[PDB]
Design a protein around this ligand. Structure first.
Ligand code: 725
Ligand code: 725
Ligand code: ZN
Ligand code: ZN
Lengths: 362, 362
């Protein structure tokens, strides 16, 4: 019988690590990509995401619980990770206070408060296995004073999240809780945030406040000093990242877990990922191209259909085209993660990262 | 090795028949439903449709031929049926003459003529296995004089279609040609059309000019006298039909083959077919319904996911929801055809039709 949570590092190369998270509902191989569950039929990825913000508004967390929780609802018996919901409230919905955030639903005008306690309860009702602390994703750019005030509030909210999670027996005994580091681009604030989170104690640690407009060079610079501040023996989750090259560089800097809307968003908009870079399949140059989306990809789409046919479907308005693109993109991301894990385990990740970049950007 | 074309009737009940069409690329069990190939990944339906009108405009028949034909393009090695293209020209695009029809492409302004000879050549370039004669689908309603003039032109075009098909060796030796009966709702014109088509000689015979606004009672009345006029020993294809109850009643009247945009169109618009009638899954009454789309359906969607989850996906704007609906609808139609074939073979089709209607309309 698997434990509630156990992270083991099997191999390392530089700052990169590969290993496993064991949870009751399954094993997660790291570095891991965690896809959205609703964009395609995901098969046994090791873990999928639930969209807390959307689920709060439709059909509501209480209703999801009445339906048996997300595992039953989505037909997925393996681990599920949910965010704390505030990122999207600030992004898509507001009135803020030390208690939390209040906002109105665009779907029907209903009122909603979101606090550390309510966010944890929502994630409990959804039934997720990895629960995120309720934080504030500081806007970018931010002055040092505003970044500090924001981070300090997030650390108070992290303690309230910890206490709310520990108060619910089923959650404390069966799920895991991750804390989220903030501090914008400032090394001293990132250090204070890491120290506060480690003092509270979490099962895993996320790097928050990135992928919010800063650009890859700046993101990598912040990761260079921020990831070593987190406990080495716990998983590191970079929220909102990212493109394939973002993932490779973040793994080089010690990140273990990733989520990004790109593969599913790109698939609905004609963009396919390949080892030679992204392609927009709607372009006329693909109308007679008999090659698969990617020449090495092992996914079911690339085994059967050509670029020309997928181009045709999308140009004809057939949803089948976008579905095949999305299935290929999710599979490409998982093949990327498998190559990353194998190369770290084999001591050739540095070479893989170099070869990957030379071809992806050629 | 299978013949170019051979239709065998295995069992009969009243006017209903069940049997097989053997062609080089496979066997087709009848009565058959023939789905669009582009709306979902169709698995070995016995035959799928190519959309001649769309393919003529994008990417063009010559280009499809350059890509290897529709079988290679779509990844489908079994039979394909194509229409002659004029129905949609009159429906979606015109200048008519005894030579054919000319029209302009809305996609790019290019000019296109469509004649019996060009329609047959287009279907040859597409590589389809069952080729339809180039006809005129008479508008409804039509006066007797206009229905007669229209039908007479279609019969001249049927002879030109026959001759064009026979002139192309690869087509004549490997494909089959169906003639299309016209005559609107008029028994004497339907008889003249059937006589003309049988004198020319075709591999199968379609009932054209229906599902164009006349309503089920009138359609059934026309089928009552029109189907017995066609050769009994050849397949009968009712073009454009239809809803599940249309199919059952048409089989009762001697039809062997069906095509309809409903299951794929309905699936993209929130309508699912069930043995208790169609349901619109977007309705709020399905938001907490844990039953599958249909309680008896054996499709992969109904084995795994609830009405509540499919409702959620569609309401959230996820294309996955429409894809699952479409896959269920195609599977439902094939389960309907299997029940029809089994019941005719077993001598219980009359009872099946009665039980089907009582429950579908309850
Ligand atoms: C795009 N850039 C990006 N930077 C982010 C930074 C943060 C952060 O500091 N705190 C929190 N709590 N969330 C963040 C998030 C949202 C992730 C969720 O976004 C959701 O997708 C929209 C996804 O869940 C389907 C995921 O939840 C697991 C970020 N997204
Ligand atoms: C909806 N009612 C309906 N009544 C019809 C009557 C006729 C007719 O008299 N002659 C011809 N030639 N075609 C007809 C058609 C079009 C069928 C095609 O319609 C195409 O779907 C749009 C489908 O191919 C993807 C199919 O081709 C196999 C009809 N459709
Ligand atoms: Zn692929
Ligand atoms: Zn089903």
């Amino acid at each position: 019988d698997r434990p509630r949570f156990s992270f083991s590092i099997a191999a390392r190369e530089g700052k990169a690590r590969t290993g496993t998270i064991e949870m009751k509902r399954g094993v997660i191989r790291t570095p891991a990509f965690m896809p959205v569950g609703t964009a395609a039929t995901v098969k046994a990825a090791d873990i999928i995401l639930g969209n807390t913000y959307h689920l709060m508004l439709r059909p509501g967390a209480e209703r999801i619980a009445k339906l048996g929780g997300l595992h039953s609802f989505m037909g997925w018996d393996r681990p599920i990770l949910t965010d704390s919901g505030g990122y999207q409230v600030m992004s898509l919905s507001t009135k803020q206070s030390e208690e939390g955030v209040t906002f109105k639903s665009h779907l029907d005008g209903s009122r909603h408060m979101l606090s550390p306690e309510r966010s944890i309860e929502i994630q409990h009702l959804l039934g997720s296995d990895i629960v995120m602390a309720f934080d504030e994703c500081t806007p970018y750019p931010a002055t040092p004073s505003r970044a500090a005030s924001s981070m300090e509030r997030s650390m108070r909210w992290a303690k309230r999240s910890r206490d709310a999670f520990d108060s619910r027996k089923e959650q404390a005994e069966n799920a895991a809780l991750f804390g989220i580091q903030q501090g914008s681009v400032f090394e001293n604030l990132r250090q204070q945030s890491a120290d506060a989170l480690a003092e509270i104690g979490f099962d895993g640690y996320a790097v928050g406040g990135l992928a919010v407009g800063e650009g890859q060079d700046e993101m990598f610079r912040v990761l260079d000093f921020s990831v070593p501040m987190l406990p080495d023996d716990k998983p590191h989750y970079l929220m909102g990242v990212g493109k394939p090259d973002d993932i490779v560089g973040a793994v080089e800097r010690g990140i273990d877990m990733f989520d990004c809307v790109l593969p599913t968003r790109s698939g609905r908009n004609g963009q396919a990922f390949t080892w030679d870079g992204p392609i927009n399949i709607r372009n006329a140059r693909f109308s007679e191209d008999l090659k698969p989306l990617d020449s090495e990809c092992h996914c079911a789409v690339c085994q059967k259909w050509s670029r020309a046919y997928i181009h045709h479907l999308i140009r004809a308005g057939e949803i089948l085209g976008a579905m095949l693109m999305t299935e290929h993109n999710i599979a490409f991301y998982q093949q990327l993660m498998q190559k990353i894990r194998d190369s770290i385990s084999e001591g050739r990740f540095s070479q893989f990262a170099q070869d990957f970049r030379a071809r992806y950007f050629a």
